[PDB]
């Protein structure tokens, strides 16, 4: 894949202040810091699922957020689960920086071994300064409590330990986090539970419920998140 490769370097030349010298120095450097390949977390059966989730999120963090502007693992959201799981395995083998969508697939791959853990995508549409912004994380449920795995440029727009007692509190935490960086939350897309079968021929349902956060209002927004939580226990 040489075409893509030189595409990434030309795009860096534009956006960075000293675009050209940066590519020269890095591509031409004979000695670079060797990056250790992150070890895939494997768990004893005695380890509680919350402690497992911290290790999965730590592994996801080690890969780092992809700031290069070029995505290394393209994801067709309509692919069957067994196709995305093959792709997650290759992220595991390539071990490259990632963005929001790739971390959701990794979170599913690494939590398929936890049948007591429910996983479901949560994507957000936010508004700021005339522009729209889309982000997505992996919602998780353990022992009746809610949390999230994901990848973001902000610390409070990804990992939440499974401590929220309702889905509303989890989502409103994200809305509050969006508000702290002056983003208005326009729309929330919540998916259905993801099968734990890594060979499953079914798609992820990214849009089982679409909530218009402005046209709904506070309490009607809360009732909709509670209906979605009720729906995942189907």
């Amino acid at each position: 894949d040489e075409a893509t490769w030189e595409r990434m370097w030309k795009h860096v030349a534009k956006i960075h202040p000293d675009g050209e010298k940066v590519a020269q120095r890095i591509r031409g450097a004979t000695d670079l810091p060797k990056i250790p390949i992150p070890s895939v977390p494997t768990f004893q059966p005695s380890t509680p699922v919350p402690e497992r989730l911290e290790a999965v999120q730590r592994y996801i963090r080690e890969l780092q957020y992809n700031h290069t502007g070029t995505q290394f693992f393209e994801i067709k959201k309509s692919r069957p689960l067994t196709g995305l799981m093959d792709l997650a395995k290759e992220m595991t083998k390539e071990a490259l920086p990632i963005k929001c969508l790739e971390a959701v697939i990794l979170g599913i791959y690494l939590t398929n071994s936890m049948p007591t853990l429910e996983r479901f995508p949560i994507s957000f549409k936010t508004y700021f300064s005339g522009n729209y912004f889309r982000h997505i994380v992996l919602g998780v449920n353990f022992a009746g409590r809610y949390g999230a795995l994901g990848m973001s440029r902000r610390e409070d727009l990804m990992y939440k330990p499974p401590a929220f007692r309702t889905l509303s509190e989890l989502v409103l935490d994200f809305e509050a986090a969006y508000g702290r960086c002056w983003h208005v939350l326009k729309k929330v897309k919540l998916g259905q539970s993801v099968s734990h079968d890594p060979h499953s021929v079914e798609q992820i349902e990214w849009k089982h419920s679409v909530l218009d956060v402005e046209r709904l209002g506070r309490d009607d927004f809360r009732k909709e998140l509670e209906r979605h939580a009720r729906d995942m226990r189907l």
Binding site: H16, Y65, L96
Partner: peptide, 24 residues
């Protein structure tokens, strides 16, 4: 293995670039 020695150097370069791009 010519494929494999190429992915390791590319990975070192991607993370070198990724570090610079985190200046924001």
């Amino acid at each position: 293995s010519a494929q494999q020695e190429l992915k390791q150097r590319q990975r070192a370069e991607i993370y070198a670039l990724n570090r610079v791009m985190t200046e924001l």
